[PDB]
């Protein structure tokens, strides 16, 4: 209301309204949470079918950036695809220049600088994405990071991105997060996603769960969720 | 007035035509036809007419024919019709202040420039050919 | 912005930069018979600041002094440019650069920044001096690219008042010490009441070379000089 | 509404309306329908003309030996992405000496159309791609959008009044998966005969069908191997 | 329905600035040109001598080759640029093709340069209109005119500048199908038909399709005006 | 109304910056030259005649440009340094190219083309 | 005033520009406090953390960024500008080490960072990196140093130094405290830093919120204190 | 809408719709495909007696069997004609054969709507293309937007509505040549304003057995006097 | 009960135009050998009264020159007037 056009200009009270408007763009996006255990990091995304036109296995927001790192994006999908390609490129340069796996702090700092560089100038807009970054290493343990649309990148035990950002972490934080291995945390994330928004505004949603840790020996892939089928036989027991 | 002229108790053959000077500030309740049909404007006269109204007005004085009407005509190329009259009358006044029969060019210059204030037609443009 | 003239007047963005110069810290500089005296007015905001870190009086070569009245952050930039340029002259000609050639090239740089249309002008007015070929000089520049030549001048707050004192006080013939005396007089006319060995900062230019005085001799001299 | 002019500007509700306007520019194309079986993928479009005497503007165009696209919207961007498509096909056909999988090609299409949707100085592409192909795992029916959010389906339909087509696809998407080519194609035109107002009927010269098969090369048909496809119908239930 | 610039169409399908850069041509000095069958002739009016300078540098008629001649209207600086580039272009045509330069080629060049100058981003259109007269192929006289749009447009006689409708109306009312004597007298009648015809502001130059440019002398033109006045008396 | 930049034309059509550069000429120092054979002269008015200058320059408006040419100046001062250096460099490049002094009219048209290059372009 | 709506970096009438003096409170949107003190042959940084979450970590909330092995810093303001400024500082210190063969003095580094911010200010079409930076380091023949770098490109450096949100009050306490001529025997420095932050913020809190970065002329390496010795200093000033 | 790089809320071309509007002011032209061959006609709209009629170009020669007609703006047509001439010669270079008319017009509409000022404006001309490929005669019509289509008998420019209507009245598929010629000039002297004579219009007919000289020169007088 | 159809109309393209042309033509002494579609193309955008004004100007010519069956040349001059000399003033020519 006065000056919020360019991404270079300041306000009479000193903040950039472009960055705020891009931050609350992801607020309308789907709910995506993440949490780590003592030997791994678990992702989970509330994903919704439009009406009946999807195929249940298209456009998966669970990407796979490096051999041990993947994203859990939410927001504008194509911008997240481009950012995932940039992250693949950065891990490519590191693997080509130093001969070992990228530490997640350095990767997150390069990605944060790339996002900040798209927030700086006036020709371009800030990104409309907010994503998660998990990892595991034998000499480092489990690491879960978090990048906002502005470019502030730091670490968590658990997080949530979407509508129910507070309404997930209200009952995320009552989890005994340290003493659990991630194979419990699979159905834990299942119940957390299943709590929020069963039928209220939309009609139907669908669950994806990504999975990295010591049990994959350092690999990162989606769970065989059909194996052990841990949502629904507990989701039907989570309504009471 | 409107109900009288071109409305009720209509024309028949009653020629009451309304000419003006502007085009803008009027109520369009009569811009629509019927009330008044045709419209005409007026530019300022051209060189062919400039020399014409010159000889019309410069005739009122024993012209010092060495003065260049065409210089006045092209310099004062936007003579609506008042400058011509006023200019020639005041040129005669300038001259006959000295009781001269002819009117040297300088008297015409003074007459016109008194008549023609605030006139700067040079660049622009002013800066061409 | 900077690409188009006014209906009748001048370059408003250069006039505003000149106003920002006139709203700056005061200074005074006097050309005498044998040397040139520069003097600034450097007040710390608090009692916390150190007086050995930032320097107003700054040499360009061993015999060329230079002060300003404006913004240090642009001052240092065009100082560094003048450094590199003077060393390029000394590369080309193997001879220390004359002050007129310095003022030409620095004025060319400032003029190039006054050209269109995305960069702002400097908010810096210089006072350049040096002792080239016996006769010393004094050259003031401005953000507009222009330059002048002074016998004694001032820039900053109350430069008009200090200049009317300079017209009355100064003359044609003095020595460097009497120049420093009248310079601290005309700077003390307009500065605050507490003037110490650190609130001022003075460099001179003898024919033997530039000399940037110390707080020892500055405190010795301005210990109630008159 | 004074923020609603360029691609760069985020809205105060976060919805960049240039993307919405490009979507609405896609909504004014011709109707077209693409749907696949387990072994054969068929996309069928609708032709139009400028006048009676002139020929019809074509929609199904060839790309590669196993790739063919439908289209809706602009035609300069259509041929631009066509040339880029053929170029990236013959690039990998040169280098790897294999046919391309479809998914990486459409990812390259999204990465191609990403740049004109984020920087300043290019417009988003008004484009209506319906892509049929063959990787090792059978037919694929993808669709694009000017927002580059490409979708995979089993049967889609884009263009003007294409929603009744979608209702038909809803009530026969279970039936689609089993059948061979002929009744599959006539399900496609039993979507196209509802993409039309009821007072006129689909003739020969205005319809186009392109089949790609697991052993069959991509081939376009026009009126003459379509006269076999147009018989085997009844009237609409008036 | 805005204002700037030369890239936007009107709401009813016009370009305002081509028509508006034609106005500077429409309000400039007059210059006419006709072709005879063997000798071509043209000339400018409004010498406009300010009593105290030289005028050999302000010449509005120049040449690019030994076969072709120039004229213009509008503003003179754009004429200076176009003539400078045109000399270069005529010489570059002489570089490859070994002919004397055809008039149609150099007019296509002028119109093409003018239009690709007008199409581009924010370049002000050349507000001139040239007359390009020459006779090369079997000594065939040609004269073409230009436009700020860039439309070369071949005529047989021409009138531009201030009040060009009246001047072209006289060539309309003269122009007979039925000899360099009638062409000289036709130039005399055209310059007598000028907007002022002061008798001393007349500047004319001719070419007899084998020669070079000939600048006349304002005593020969005085006898031309005298025989025009004699024929005007013989009309009565 | 149709102000914004040096380009494009006004609706009659005239120019904006040309007349306004002329009106930027009008408030400056006065120069002249005189009609003389076997010699020619220049006159100039001193701007800023204040008593605390130096006058050590011998020339504030005159610029002896080649050997047998000088030039006065009027207008905005610091554009003229850019112009005088470039003009000297043009004439000196001519002398380098031919080893004959510059016959002054192609010098004048060179500077006019330099100025006209900023009259046409934008912005 | 404006009027001109101060959208780009130009000069307004009488006489300032508003972009940089809007950037001077981009620090103030950080919600954070920093204090530096130089008394003697040591130098102390102190800065608190605002972590409301138990799900959030504690190691990676660190604002003390070890620039080189003898130079530390702390940041306030928004985080992205701060971290990018820190990597520019590290890159340019490494450039010094490559070009000139020895360890960079802390003065030239602040000059180079200020010049980068001025170039970001001089040319438009870039945001002027709204974060403030305080540096510390030991130099031979000069002792310890404390410097401050502005977003405008105005470096300075001085004895008792503070920037953030509430540092008019901090400099008021440091004028009311650095006026008595006692020496500063390193626990005098730690005690005055803890108590100056404890009087400005008035919290008197656990040893787990503030971060303490020190450097001393006995071990010129930059050093971040541990919870045990932070607790030791806090109860050592507890009377 | 101001600008070639902004869509509409609905479905407006703007930078192109105003070009399609700018077509309509130009002079008319009529080309008719017949299996015997393609005929073509145009109106010059001669203003002056000094306006020399053979210098106004409407029908130019691209190939030995490929003709053309232009519309509206003159110089965009000059650009496209120049490039079209250059590229057919390139085709003859690398293929020893004639670039067919569909390939010609695709080669033109590769950049007929490719207007970009950064990374210039859209063109203001409608074109009518006739030629004889291996499939016999062809008649082709493009637009500024590159939306190129085949047309059997297309009319452009001014008064094209009644031209199309009265053209669809008389035309069918099995017409002859001369019947189509006089049917065209009937439509012409119903849509022109001046008296039809030797200097107003010009024809261009191409036959497979008469590939050379796609023109009629003052036997056109004999054609007009037969009405 | 009050107003229940909500019809609307605006400028007809040429057909209602041509019809009104003929209407006002037979409404006065005109030449039958004239056409309208030609004149219709001339008519860019106008109300019937404007068109009626074209008819009036044709009458003005037929008052100047002794015309009975107002010819399409009388109407040609009338069109010159209405659509060029009355399109707004005269400001079209001098560029083809
Ligand atoms: N559609 C039409 N059919 C027949 N005559 C028409 C038509 N439109 C206009 N005219 C004639 O042109 C003249 C225009 O008059 P009106 O149409 O009443 O003016 P108007 O200003 O449109 O009236 P309003 O404001 O809609 S009540 C009439 O005298 C009609 O004879």
Curated annotation (Swiss-Prot), chain B:
Residues that the record marks as modified (Phosphothreonine) are 123
Where are the Phosphotyrosine residues found in this chain?
A: 128
User: Which compartments is it annotated to reside in?
Assistant: Cytoplasm; Nucleus; Membrane
- Superkingdom of the source species: Eukaryota
Q: Could you say which residues form the signal peptide?
A: none
Quaternary arrangement and interactors, per the entry? Component of the 19S proteasome regulatory particle complex. The 26S proteasome consists of a 20S core particle (CP) and two 19S regulatory subunits (RP). The regulatory particle is made of a lid composed of 9 subunits, a base containing 6 ATPases including PSMC1 and few additional components. Interacts with SCA7. Interacts with NGLY1. Interacts with PAAF1.
Give the function comment from the record: Component of the 26S proteasome, a multiprotein complex involved in the ATP-dependent degradation of ubiquitinated proteins. This complex plays a key role in the maintenance of protein homeostasis by removing misfolded or damaged proteins, which could impair cellular functions, and by removing proteins whose functions are no longer required. Therefore, the proteasome participates in numerous cellular processes, including cell cycle progression, apoptosis, or DNA damage repair.
What clinical condition is it connected to? Birk-Aharoni syndrome: An autosomal recessive disorder characterized by failure to thrive, severe developmental delay, intellectual disability, spastic tetraplegia with central hypotonia, chorea, hearing loss, micropenis and undescended testes, as well as mild elevation of liver enzymes.
What protein family is recorded?
Belongs to the AAA ATPase family.
The name under which this protein is listed is 26S proteasome regulatory subunit 4
From Swiss-Prot, chain C:
Where's it found, cell-wise?
A: Cytoplasm; Nucleus
Q: Which GO terms describe its cellular component?
A: cytoplasm; cytosol; extracellular exosome; extracellular region; ficolin-1-rich granule lumen; nucleoplasm; nucleus; P-body
- UniProt keyword Phosphoprotein, yes or no: yes
Write down which residues bear the modification named Phosphotyrosine: 16, 68, 113
Q: Which SMART domains match?
A: Proteasome_A_N
Q: Residues bearing N6-acetyllysine?
A: 62, 163
A GO BP annotation:
proteasome-mediated ubiquitin-dependent protein catabolic process
Provide this UniProt record's keywords sorted from A to Z. Answer: Acetylation, Cytoplasm, Nucleus, Phosphoprotein, Proteasome
Entry comment on modification after translation: Phosphorylated on tyrosine residues; which may be important for nuclear import.
Assigned protein family: Belongs to the peptidase T1A family.
State whether it acts alone or in a complex, and with which partners, per the record: The 26S proteasome consists of a 20S proteasome core and two 19S regulatory subunits. The 20S proteasome core is a barrel-shaped complex made of 28 subunits that are arranged in four stacked rings. The two outer rings are each formed by seven alpha subunits, and the two inner rings are formed by seven beta subunits. The proteolytic activity is exerted by three beta-subunits PSMB5, PSMB6 and PSMB7.
Tell me what this protein is called.
Answer: Proteasome subunit alpha type-2
Swiss-Prot record, chain E:
Output the Gene3D superfamilies linked to this UniProt entry: Glutamine Phosphoribosylpyrophosphate, subunit 1, domain 1
A single GO BP annotation from the record? proteasome-mediated ubiquitin-dependent protein catabolic process
**A cellular component annotation (GO) from this entry:** nucleoplasm
Sorted keywords for this record are: Acetylation, Cytoplasm, Glycoprotein, Host-virus interaction, Nucleus, Phosphoprotein, Proteasome
Q: List the disulfide bonds.
A: none
Q: What is its main location?
A: cytoplasm
* Entry-linked SMART domains: Proteasome_A_N (SM00948)
Which compartments does it reside in?
Cytoplasm; Nucleus
Modified sites of kind N6-acetyllysine: 223
Kindly list every residue the record annotates as glycosylated: 129
Phosphotyrosine PTM positions read 152
Q: Name one GO molecular function term.
A: identical protein binding
Q: What induces it?
A: Down-regulated by the ribozyme Rz3'X. Up-regulated in colorectal cancer tissues.
Q: Which family does it belong to?
A: Belongs to the peptidase T1A family.
Query: Partners and quaternary state?
Result: The 26S proteasome consists of a 20S proteasome core and two 19S regulatory subunits. The 20S proteasome core is a barrel-shaped complex made of 28 subunits that are arranged in four stacked rings. The two outer rings are each formed by seven alpha subunits, and the two inner rings are formed by seven beta subunits. The proteolytic activity is exerted by three beta-subunits PSMB5, PSMB6 and PSMB7. PSMA7 interacts directly with the PSMG1-PSMG2 heterodimer which promotes 20S proteasome assembly. Interacts with HIF1A. Interacts with RAB7A. Interacts with PRKN. Interacts with ABL1 and ABL2.
Q: What is this protein called?
A: Proteasome subunit alpha type-7
Species for this entry: Homo sapiens (Human)
At the highest ranks, the source species' classification is: Eukaryota, Metazoa, Chordata, Craniata, Vertebrata
Q: Which gene is this protein's source?
A: PSMA7
UniProtKB/Swiss-Prot annotation, chain H:
Classify the source by domain of life: Eukaryota
Write down the InterPro entries for this protein, in alphabetical order.
Ntn_hydrolases_N (IPR029055), Proteasome_alpha (IPR050115), Proteasome_alpha-type (IPR023332), Proteasome_alpha_type_5 (IPR033812), Proteasome_asu_N (IPR000426), Proteasome_sua/b (IPR001353)
Q: Which residues carry this modification: Phosphothreonine?
A: 47
The UniProt entry's GO biological process terms, in alphabetical order, are: proteasome-mediated ubiquitin-dependent protein catabolic process
Protein biosynthesis as a keyword of this entry, yes or no, is: no
Subcellular localization is given as: Cytoplasm; Nucleus
What switches on its expression? Up-regulated in colon cancer cell lines. Up-regulated in fetal Down syndrome (DS) brain (at protein level). May be the target of the transcriptional activator NFE2L2.
Q: In which tissues is it expressed?
A: Expressed in fetal brain (at protein level).
Q: Which GO terms describe its cellular component?
A: cytoplasm; cytosol; extracellular exosome; extracellular region; ficolin-1-rich granule lumen; nucleoplasm; nucleus; proteasome complex
**Chief site of localization:** cytoplasm
The UniProt subunit note reads as follows:
The 26S proteasome consists of a 20S proteasome core and two 19S regulatory subunits. The 20S proteasome core is a barrel-shaped complex made of 28 subunits that are arranged in four stacked rings. The two outer rings are each formed by seven alpha subunits, and the two inner rings are formed by seven beta subunits. The proteolytic activity is exerted by three beta-subunits PSMB5, PSMB6 and PSMB7. PSMA5 interacts directly with the PSMG1-PSMG2 heterodimer which promotes 20S proteasome assembly.
NCBIfam families reported for this sequence: PRK03996.1
Protein's UniProt name:
Proteasome subunit alpha type-5
